[PDB]
């Protein structure tokens, strides 16, 4: 599924991601924009053989099981495929765990480099919320 910008804002809010760990909704929408372009089926292979999955490009090294990332963990207790679903519940639930892990949204490289400190409210501007 390819989400529209306000459509994803609304889905994220329904699943309680707005202001989760103090991160406003625009930060989550921005991160999803530059991680996946709002496509739930986005995947990206890393040089280390791990893979990033879904709207927020969650990595198999630590958070999900894909069977092909030696030495890896599955801290969200889900198959990585679940992160590619049209319904974002598994990705939101896993994102809450990630963002609680200590470095906040800096775990998302694309957030740090393209969203952090920018006018992230722009991503929810005009949205009926
Ligand atoms: Au905002
Ligand atoms: Au992999
Ligand atoms: Au794993
Ligand atoms: Au397996
Ligand atoms: Au594995
Ligand atoms: Au599994
Ligand atoms: Au923080």
Coordinates of C-alpha atoms and ligand atoms in Angstrom, one line a residue:
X1 CA 0.0 0.0 0.0
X2 CA 1.1 3.5 -0.9
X3 CA -0.2 6.0 1.7
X4 CA -1.0 9.5 1.1
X5 CA 0.5 12.0 3.5
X6 CA -2.5 12.8 5.6
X7 CA -3.8 9.3 5.3
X8 CA -0.7 8.0 7.0
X9 CA -0.8 10.8 9.6
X10 CA -4.2 9.6 10.5
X11 CA -3.3 5.9 10.7
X12 CA -0.3 6.8 12.9
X13 CA -2.5 8.8 15.2
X14 CA -5.2 6.0 15.5
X15 CA -2.4 3.6 16.6
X16 CA -1.1 6.1 19.2
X17 CA 2.2 7.1 17.6
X18 CA 1.5 10.9 17.8
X19 CA 3.6 12.3 20.6
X20 CA 4.9 8.8 21.5
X21 CA 8.1 9.3 23.5
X22 CA 7.6 13.1 22.8
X23 CA 7.8 12.8 19.1
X24 CA 5.1 14.7 17.4
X25 CA 3.1 13.3 14.4
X26 CA 5.1 15.3 11.8
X27 CA 8.3 13.6 12.9
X28 CA 6.8 10.1 12.3
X29 CA 5.3 11.2 8.9
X30 CA 8.6 12.8 7.8
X31 CA 10.5 9.7 8.8
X32 CA 8.1 7.5 6.9
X33 CA 8.4 9.8 3.8
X34 CA 12.2 9.4 3.6
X35 CA 12.4 5.8 4.7
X36 CA 9.8 4.3 2.4
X37 CA 8.1 7.1 0.4
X38 CA 5.0 5.9 2.3
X39 CA 5.1 2.5 0.7
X40 CA 4.4 -0.4 3.1
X41 CA 6.1 -2.8 0.8
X42 CA 9.4 -1.0 0.7
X43 CA 12.5 -3.2 1.4
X44 CA 16.2 -2.3 1.4
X45 CA 19.2 -4.7 1.7
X46 CA 22.0 -3.5 3.9
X47 CA 25.7 -4.3 3.1
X48 CA 25.8 -6.4 6.3
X49 CA 23.1 -8.8 4.8
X50 CA 20.3 -7.4 7.1
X51 CA 17.2 -6.0 5.5
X52 CA 15.0 -3.0 6.2
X53 CA 11.2 -3.6 5.9
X54 CA 8.2 -1.5 5.6
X55 CA 7.0 2.1 6.0
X56 CA 9.6 2.9 8.6
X57 CA 12.3 0.5 7.2
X58 CA 12.7 -1.5 10.4
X59 CA 15.9 -3.7 10.4
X60 CA 16.2 -7.4 10.7
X61 CA 19.5 -7.1 12.6
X62 CA 17.5 -6.5 15.8
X63 CA 13.8 -6.1 15.4
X64 CA 12.2 -8.8 13.3
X65 CA 12.9 -12.3 12.0
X66 CA 13.5 -12.9 8.3
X67 CA 15.5 -16.1 8.6
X68 CA 18.5 -14.7 6.7
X69 CA 20.3 -12.4 9.0
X70 CA 22.8 -14.5 11.0
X71 CA 23.4 -13.5 14.6
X72 CA 20.4 -11.3 14.5
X73 CA 17.7 -10.8 17.1
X74 CA 13.8 -10.5 16.8
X75 CA 13.0 -8.0 19.6
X76 CA 9.5 -7.2 18.2
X77 CA 8.7 -10.9 18.0
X78 CA 7.4 -10.8 14.5
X79 CA 8.2 -12.0 11.0
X80 CA 9.7 -9.2 9.0
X81 CA 7.0 -9.8 6.4
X82 CA 4.4 -8.5 8.9
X83 CA 6.1 -5.1 8.5
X84 CA 5.0 -5.0 4.8
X85 CA 1.3 -5.2 5.5
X86 CA -1.2 -2.7 4.3
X87 CA -2.2 -2.3 7.9
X88 CA 0.5 -0.5 9.8
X89 CA -0.2 -2.0 13.3
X90 CA 2.9 -4.2 13.4
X91 CA 5.2 -1.5 12.2
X92 CA 3.8 1.0 14.7
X93 CA 4.1 -1.4 17.6
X94 CA 7.7 -2.2 16.6
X95 CA 8.5 1.4 16.1
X96 CA 7.4 2.2 19.7
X97 CA 9.9 -0.4 20.9
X98 CA 12.7 1.0 18.8
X99 CA 12.1 4.6 19.8
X100 CA 12.1 3.5 23.5
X101 CA 15.5 1.8 23.1
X102 CA 17.6 4.8 24.1
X103 CA 18.5 7.0 21.2
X104 CA 15.0 8.0 20.3
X105 CA 14.3 8.6 16.7
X106 CA 18.0 8.7 15.9
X107 CA 17.7 5.0 15.3
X108 CA 16.2 6.1 11.9
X109 CA 19.2 7.4 9.9
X110 CA 16.9 9.1 7.4
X111 CA 15.1 10.9 10.3
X112 CA 18.3 12.2 11.7
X113 CA 19.6 13.4 8.4
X114 CA 16.5 14.7 6.8
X115 CA 13.8 15.4 9.5
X116 CA 15.5 16.2 12.8
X117 CA 15.4 20.0 13.5
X118 CA 13.4 20.7 10.3
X119 CA 9.9 22.1 10.2
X120 CA 8.3 18.7 10.6
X121 CA 4.9 20.1 11.2
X122 CA 4.7 20.7 7.5
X123 CA 4.1 17.0 7.0
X124 CA 0.8 17.2 8.9
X125 CA -0.2 20.7 7.6
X126 CA -3.7 20.8 6.2
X127 CA -4.5 17.3 7.5
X128 CA -7.9 16.8 9.1
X129 CA -6.8 15.5 12.5
Ligands
LIG1 AU1 4.2 17.9 14.0
LIG2 AU1 18.2 -9.9 5.6
LIG3 AU1 16.3 -10.8 13.1
LIG4 AU1 12.6 -18.2 9.7
LIG5 AU1 17.9 -14.8 11.1
LIG6 AU1 9.1 -15.5 12.3
LIG7 AU1 14.3 11.3 22.9

